[PDB]
Amino acid sequence: TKEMKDFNQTFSVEILNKSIGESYNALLNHIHLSPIINFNYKASNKTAFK
Amino acid sequence: LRKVVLDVELGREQVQLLYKPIYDSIADSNL
Numbered sequence A: 001t002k003e004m005k006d007f008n009q010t011f012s013v014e015i016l017n018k019s020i021g022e023s024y025n026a027l028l029n030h031i032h033l034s035p036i037i038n039f040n041y042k043a044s045n046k047t048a049f050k
Numbered sequence B: 001l002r003k004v005v006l007d008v009e010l011g012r013e014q015v016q017l018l019y020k021p022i023y024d025s026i027a028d029s030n031l
Helices: A004-008 A013-038
Strands: none
Touching: none
């Protein structure tokens, strides 16, 4: 609401943009690294601790 | 024939700010 932005001293669109940017970067990491992690690796790829 | 309108004085009255001599104004968007 306009009242929340106008009356609340600490709230601002800057913190909302910060949250958007943080979630966006985390989304990019997830999109570009979860295919690597969630893949069902065959025995050809996998290597034991040894 | 020519159409001419009776230029009469109508419309609602103007309203003035009468409170100003009493109150002490405080102007700040930070309130």
